[PDB]
């Protein structure tokens, strides 16, 4: 028995982009999940298939702590049965998802005067992602009938676009760090 290394996930200095969302695989450890839900730092805390207080009373093998950065108005897409650029092309949760979605505003960390363009998202994709699928490809998206041949332009767009995170952006356009906990339920 030992506490889960959740500090390394939530209190990480830098977060991965949503298209390359990082996954932390943790064994069946113990953690006061009731304290996490009762943390004032988390503005979004939605659980599916299980209550936040009854998380310790679950029987599972591995818990996955997926983490990434999206904007404010896209947090609604980190939920089962959602559509949009994030849910279809970046990070997709299954319909029978068992776990919780945690998010909080990170404007003070991920925004920079003049714009922070380090965080990216997949804008073009031929098909929707399967649940828990990750796509880091940088193939030039052929939106036209003519092949691109690794040359971008009209009808040939880079599938990834950078967020424009400025401190003066609206709250719907400010960066939000998201942590998704999933359980390989036994």
């Amino acid at each position, epitope marked *: 028995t030992n506490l889960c290394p959740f500090g390394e996930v939530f209190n990480a200095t830098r977060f991965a982009s949503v298209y390359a969302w990082n996954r932390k695989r943790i064994s069946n450890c113990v953690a006061d999940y009731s304290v996490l839900y009762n943390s004032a730092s988390f503005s979004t805390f939605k659980c599916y298939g299980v209550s936040p207080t009854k998380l310790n009373d679950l029987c599972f093998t591995n818990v996955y702590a997926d983490s990434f950065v999206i904007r404010g108005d896209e947090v609604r897409q980190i939920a089962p049965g959602q*559509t*949009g*650029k994030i849910a*279809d*092309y970046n990070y997709k949760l299954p319909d029978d998802f068992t776990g919780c979605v945690i998010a909080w505003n990170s404007n003070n960390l991920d925004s920079k005067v003049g714009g922070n363009y380090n965080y990216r998202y997949r*804008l*073009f*994709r*031929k*098909s*929707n992602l399967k649940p828990f699928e990750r796509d880091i490809s940088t193939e030039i*998206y*052929q*939106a*036209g*009938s*003519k092949p691109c041949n690794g040359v971008e*332009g*009209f*009808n040939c*767009y880079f599938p990834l*676009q950078s967020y*424009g995170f400025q401190p003066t*952006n*609206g*709250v*719907g*356009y400010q960066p939000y760090r998201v942590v998704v906990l999933s359980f390989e339920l036994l």
Partner: antibody, heavy 118, light 108 residues
Framework: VQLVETGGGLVQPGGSLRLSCEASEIIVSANYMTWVRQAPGKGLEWVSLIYPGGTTYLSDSLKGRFTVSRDNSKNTMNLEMNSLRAGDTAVYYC?????????????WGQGTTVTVSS | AIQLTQSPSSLSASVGDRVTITCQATHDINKFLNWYQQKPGKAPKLLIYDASNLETGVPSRFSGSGFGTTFTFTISSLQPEDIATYFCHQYENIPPIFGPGTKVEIKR
């Protein structure tokens, strides 16, 4: 690029009409495609939008009656209009809107005239 | 729904003058407003995207500015071939709604 609308005309009220949108130079199945109508003498009004992964969206005044399908064999955009009303009489354009602020991406069609009257 | 208030509906002026069109959004759309130009009987053509970026091939006399809720569409020197109807459209909040429109005429 060339977008040509067809399948319009006149239809009795409450009838069904299928608008076609033949597309050259671009692949339909892998693009954001929108249908936008403009009533005679009125302004523009968004009708529908389809993502390059299938994800569709409709207006509130048209939800449950219009349907945007896509066809890769003919590279044609399709807009099926059921339960047509007098207020649906307008000119419909199929366009590939600019997504992500990429210049040169936006392109519109010629437009087709739909007349819903008896 | 985000209602766009584009004013005025008609600002007839002479060739060579300055044009100023204001568009207001009910909610916050950040910088994602597109300005389209529509000739009589023709399809709309994109002039300004992201409220401040000129499109490919568009003459430089056109310009845009503004973010959040209020946006401005400016023609540095009004021209003969610039006579059309101009709409503002937010495209990142479904349902995307156009402006009422501005019928640009000429005084002479």
């Amino acid at each position: 690029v060339q977008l040509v609308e067809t399948g319009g005309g006149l239809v009795q009220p409450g009838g069904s009409l299928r608008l076609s949108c033949e597309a050259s130079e671009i692949i339909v199945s892998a693009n954001y495609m929108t249908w936008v109508r403009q009533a005679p003498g009125k302004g523009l009004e968004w009708v529908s939008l389809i993502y390059p992964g299938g994800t569709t969206y409709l207006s509130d005044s048209l939800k449950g009656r219009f349907t945007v399908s896509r066809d890769n064999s003919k590279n044609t955009m399709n807009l099926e209009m059921n339960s047509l009303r007098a207020g649906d009489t307008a000119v419909y354009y199929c366009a590939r809107l600019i997504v992500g602020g990429i210049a040169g991406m936006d392109v519109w069609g010629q437009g087709t005239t739909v007349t819903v009257s008896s | 729904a985000i209602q766009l208030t584009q004013s005025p509906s008609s600002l007839s002026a002479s060739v060579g003058d300055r044009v100023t069109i204001t568009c207001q959004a009910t909610h916050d759309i950040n910088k994602f407003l597109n300005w389209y130009q529509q000739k009589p009987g023709k399809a709309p053509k994109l002039l300004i995207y992201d409220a401040s970026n000129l499109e490919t091939g568009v003459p430089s006399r056109f310009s845009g500015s503004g973010f959040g809720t209020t946006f401005t569409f400016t023609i540095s020197s009004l021209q003969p071939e610039d006579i059309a109807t101009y709409f503002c459209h937010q495209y990142e909040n479904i349902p995307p709604i156009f402006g009422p429109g501005t019928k640009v005429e000429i005084k002479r």
